[model samples]
Target: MNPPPPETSQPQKPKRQTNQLQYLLRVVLKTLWKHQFAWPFQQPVDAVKLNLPDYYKIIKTPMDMGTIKKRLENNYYWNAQECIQDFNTMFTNCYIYNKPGDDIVLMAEALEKLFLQKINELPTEE
Candidate 1:
């Protein structure tokens, strides 16, 4: 018997889960902060507050780790794309004592380096 065609055997792409990605991003950032980034007595100043439109403040508070969770949970976005984009915005948000844009590159880098396989080990979302 002949083997199945290539197209027929190809695996389907995974559906993008907004909640999982958002949660994973939060998990990674929070872990990064708690483990490596925090100072003892002085908290990092909120940098997103500077050089931004008033509307941005209305939508979400400045992107400091201390305030990020509440912002993500409360900020209004129409869809996942908007949601993910805002997450990226928050991830890249600077501080007064910033570390060169958080040394950011891309989502691929964030997933590969920051998250590693930990995101994969997370429980699957419904």
Candidate 2:
């Protein structure tokens, strides 16, 4: 039998794979923002308004959910690891700035637990 003609070239993969992961990241962020305990972390700690003069001195790298969302929107994270690191930093700052038993610290711990759980559920590979 005669050989068949060459098949057409397959379409190249789209660049949206990264966006899929980014979308999932946004979902996780949304969940955290909606959580009741996440209120304190929704925005940056206002040293002036909250009368926390030492806050800046203690938290060299201030992070918050709102800022994280902004960064995510701006494609600031090259990978999920970077995004997760910021989340950890946000919680770490809270832990360092507040006592363990303080209400805000407790909230941060609760929210952090949820954050970890959600991130763990993400896909292992792109």
Candidate 3:
């Protein structure tokens, strides 16, 4: 009896490009930040929608752990805690920091405050 066709050469495994864990983590994070639909539709992408509160509680568990695996695998130098902190950094909304308009300094200050007050409040070990 011939063995089934080689599944090894299937060419797709659902976890294409970025693994499912990474995708799921990004989805949850974006939801928490109310970041929006998603950018690039692929790759690291960008935030396309904005619904922070809903995203927070929903984004948890195995999902975070799942992505951490891939992240460490890809980056090769980061652990889970470091991964979380790095993600926190990406949560920054540089737009609010400096815009090409009047009162740029004031805007930057306000943005800093907002980041401290809002984004910093997301899930972290500390």
Candidate 4:
């Protein structure tokens, strides 16, 4: 009779990789939170207070930095792409709700650009 070899390998790549991505994302998020244009995006839009009656009607899936932060803390994102997607959704919602050239739209545009640039600077390992 021959003895079977012990299991030495485990599937732990994604867990550690996700942690690294999360750290990078946290750094990016901290920068965004300090930006001047981040005021409107810091938290979820208050449709009632803001008197945007149709906000919810237009922006079905509203996203904000606060929610994204919580998601990151909870390890809800598996990769940087997912985090970027949420930011895109947030900015897209602003564009969809506000007219072009509007203050909020402009802010969103700037913030989106900055976010993309920062995200691109992140390392992409094979």
lDDT of each: 0.39, 0.74, 0.34, 0.74
Off by over 4 Å in 4: 1-20
Candidate 4 residue pairs that clash? none
Write model 4 residue lDDT over 1-126, tens digit each, in one string: 112222223333345446446655567888788888999998888887788888777877778888887766656666777777888888999998999989899998888888877777676543
Q: How badly does each model clash, as a count of residue pairs?
A: 0, 0, 14, 0
Question: By TM-score, how accurate is candidate 1?
Answer: 0.34
lDDT of 3: 0.34
- The better candidate by TM-score, 1 or 3, is 1
Pairwise TM-score winner, candidates 1 and 4 = 4
lDDT by residue (15-102, candidate 3, tens digit) is 3333323432454334433323222111221122432333323323112222333454444322234455534433332222235454
TM-score of 4: 0.80
lDDT of 2 by residue, 1-126 (tens): 222222222244333446435754567998998999988887777777788878777777777888787766655555677678878999999999889899888888899999878877787656
Q: What is the lDDT of residue 41 in candidate 4?
A: 94
Model 1: CA > 4 A from native: 1-26, 38-61, 72-84, 95-112, 115-125
Per-residue error for 112 in candidate 2, Å, reads 0.5
Candidate number of the best TM-score:
2
The digit string of per-residue lDDT tens for model 1 on 21-101 reads: 456446744664554323221132323444433434343333333333433344332234443443344444432234443
Quick one: RMSD of model 3?
15.6
- Give the Å shift of residue 98 in candidate 2: 0.6
